[PDB]
Design a protein around this ligand. Structure first.
Ligand SMILES: Nc1ncnc2c1ncn2[C@@H]1O[C@H](CSCC[C@H](N)C(=O)O)[C@@H](O)[C@H]1O
Ligand SMILES: CC(C)(C(=O)O)C(=O)O
Ligand SMILES: [Mn+2]
Length: 636
């Protein structure tokens, strides 16, 4: 493609970064967060929480955001320490927050008393700083609600003589703005908006998901330091005040549809699988929305699969499921001319779905279950298994989740919740499997490193602020593996494709008889007795490995019995993951297949592990398990 585009993609991502970060920085500044960390240099989160009477959950979201922007960092003892970048909070005009409430619709159409000349001028002086990232962060506060309103009124699609439907003053400001941004130019005759100008106009709708949370972000003060339920509580009408949902849904659909196409190869594979009669009959989408994905899947089957040639004899029935009756209605209308069924249901209640299906006469073992981008937005159910939750508490999970009081849900509680949620789904999944697309958060160390390349700084923040439940992509794959659900190699896709970070996974989960979980210190006695490719490992080395990476050694169990285990090392600025040990128990039926599945799972897990650029040892340890007797294992 073209050369200007690397710079242009950075700008538009930075704009969305600033749209969320500026409310956080401003609220933290006004409340004395940066001065508190000056008067005392090393404070833990709960000390900050106590002294500022803060909401620990939302405040954790802010601190993570500030750490990803390098305004602070955490010590070995998890204490927060300011950096030189933190002084940038003084450069930010705290009146910028007015723009989250400014009627840009009335400004265009000249029905407003006060314009935006000061901000346009601020933008032209690069916001009185030489930090290029900072200037773009502040621009995004202005440009995002402005660029969106310009397109909503078609003031940009006629790129010949832009702005002439506007009064002279309005025309002059906007012209000065775009010309200073390099978005427009005028050589002869009239004004013409350039490449970077068209780039921004074409991609505008992406910004609409971030922009739709402007009400929530305006009340950052209340989230961090007040009563957060005043931001979210819903009327008798039951309309959402924290987000403009209508713009959200539309902008979201336009993004999700990019990933719907990756289900095509899965669908085609499933419905080419011989024989026809053993294929699924029902395709059941939990959280169907407007039914876009169901419609696509049906057409792909009809046009591109063996199944599509014989629907007369072997019909397919599409089933949309949603907890919102309006969604069922739009879905029922979008699926015209497709054999379909719409029924109410909830992402947290697979048992009720199954009961509702049988009431319709649907044979449950003939269902392919699907969904996209819904598990992270489920109603949070607290863990019921307190023992396993307790065993989990010593793993170093970095999930940030906020409850209804704005209190921080401990990371191991959030993971245990996800595990128990997926277990409920696992108990109804059939031989046909579970097609599942999900979005995922990143760790701040990885976000820090890929600030220009990835959407995570703002996406993870507004997701956690709004009490949604993102996890890292490896945590999600582990939670599925703990309950027997494994993402099929041939179906899998992750995004971004070539950076060492995973924001989106496309999965075809299949239910298997075994589970995969993290090895812990409690497994060492059993581990010592396994057959082992390297000479028998002694307990201290297991302790060393378990201590430096508590969530990087995987073991496979079947009916409570250890079958196999793989330990790893993470090295080289945490960019390299390497296979370090391979253990099996050859007394377990089909152990060699299972050990091969575990090596396969470790590769997939390492592919989605935050920050991992390459995996070492796959060939060496594949050879060890593939030619087991010739490889001369110990203790076999
Ligand atoms: N707890 C819940 N149970 C079932 N459906 C839910 C739900 N929460 C939200 N939904 C539905 O899930 C949808 C989220 S928006 C559309 C999501 C769709 N799967 C897609 O990727 O385009 C809404 O239609 C919403 O009503
Ligand atoms: C729908 C959307 C944008 C949100 O949660 O606001 C998402 O999950 O990506
Ligand atoms: Mn979401």
């Amino acid at each position: 493609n073209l050369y200007f585009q690397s710079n242009a993609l950075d700008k538009i991502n930075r704009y969305a970064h600033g749209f969320v970060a500026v409310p956080v920085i401003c609220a933290c500044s006004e409340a004395g967060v940066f001065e508190l960390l000056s008067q005392k240099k090393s404070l833990k989160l709960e000390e900050i929480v106590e002294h500022l009477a803060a909401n620990s959950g939302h405040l954790m979201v802010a601190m993570r955001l500030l750490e990803s922007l390098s305004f602070l960092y955490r010590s070995q003892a998890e204490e927060y320490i300011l950096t030189e970048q933190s002084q940038q909070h003084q450069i930010i005009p705290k009146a910028l927050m007015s723009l989250y409430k400014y009627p840009f619709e009335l400004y265009l159409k000249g029905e407003v008393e006060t314009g935006i000349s000061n901000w346009i001028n601020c933008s032209s002086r690069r916001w009185d700083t030489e930090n290029s990232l900072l200037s773009d962060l502040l621009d995004g506060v202005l440009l995002i609600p402005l660029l969106l309103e310009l397109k909503k009124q078609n003031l940009l699609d006629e790129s010949k003589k832009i702005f002439n439907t506007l009064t002279n003053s309005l025309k002059q400001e906007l012209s000065t703005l775009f010309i200073n941004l390099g978005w427009a130019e005028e050589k002869t005759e009239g004004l013409y908006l350039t490449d970077i100008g068209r780039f921004m106009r074409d991609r505008s709708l992406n910004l609409g998901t971030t922009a739709s949370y402007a009400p929530m972000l305006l009340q950052m003060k209340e989230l961090l330091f007040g009563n957060p339920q005043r931001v979210f509580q819903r009327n008798k009408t039951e309309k959402e005040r924290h987000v403009n949902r209508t713009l959200n849904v539309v902008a979201s659909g336009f993004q999700h549809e990019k990933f719907f196409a990756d289900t095509d190869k899965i669908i085609i594979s499933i419905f080419n699988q011989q024989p026809i009669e053993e294929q699924p009959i029902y395709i059941v989408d939990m959280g169907c929305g407007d039914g876009t994905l169901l419609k696509r899947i049906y057409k792909i089957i009809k046009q591109f699969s063996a199944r599509g040639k014989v629907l007369t004899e072997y019909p397919i029935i599409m089933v949309g499921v949603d907890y919102n009756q309006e969604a069922l209605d739009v879905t029922d209308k979008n699926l015209v001319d497709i054999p379909h069924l719409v029924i109410p249901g909830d992402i947290g209640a697979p048992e009720k779905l199954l009961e509702q299906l049988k009431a319709q006469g649907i044979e449950p073992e003939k269902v392919l279950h699907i969904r996209s981008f819904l598990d992270h937005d489920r109603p949070f159910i607290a863990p019921k298994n307190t023992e396993i939750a307790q065993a989990r508490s010593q793993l170093d999970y970095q999930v940030v989740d906020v409850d209804r009081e704005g209190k921080l849900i401990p990371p191991h509680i959030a993971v245990q919740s996800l595990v128990e949620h997926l277990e409920r789904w696992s108990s109804i999944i059939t031989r046909h499997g579970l097609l599942l697309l999900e979005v995922h958060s990143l760790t701040p160390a990885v976000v820090k490193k890929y600030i220009d390349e990835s959407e995570s700084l703002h996406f993870d923040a507004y997701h956690a602020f709004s009490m949604q439940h993102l996890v890292e992509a490896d945590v999600f794959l582990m939670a599925a593996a703990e309950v027997g659900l494994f993402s099929r190699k041939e179906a899998f896709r992750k995004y971004p494709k070539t950076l060492p970070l995973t924001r989106i996974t496309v999965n075809h989960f299949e239910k298997r008889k075994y589970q995969i979980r993290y090895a812990t210190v409690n497994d060492i006695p059993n581990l010592l007795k396994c057959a082992t490719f390297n000479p028998p490992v002694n307990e201290p080395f297991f302790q060393v490995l378990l201590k430096q990476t508590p969530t990087a050694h995987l073991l496979l169990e079947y009916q409570g019995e250890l079958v196999a285990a793989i330990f790893t090392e993470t090295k080289n600025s945490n960019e390299v993951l390497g296979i370090r040990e391979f253990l099996v128990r050859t007394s377990v039926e089909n152990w060699q297949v299972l050990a091969k599945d575990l090596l396969e799972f470790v590769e997939q897990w390492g592919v989605v592990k935050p920050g991992i650029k390459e995996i070492e040892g796959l060939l060496k340890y594949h050879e060890a398990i593939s030619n087991f007797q010739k490889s001369k294992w110990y203790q076999s």
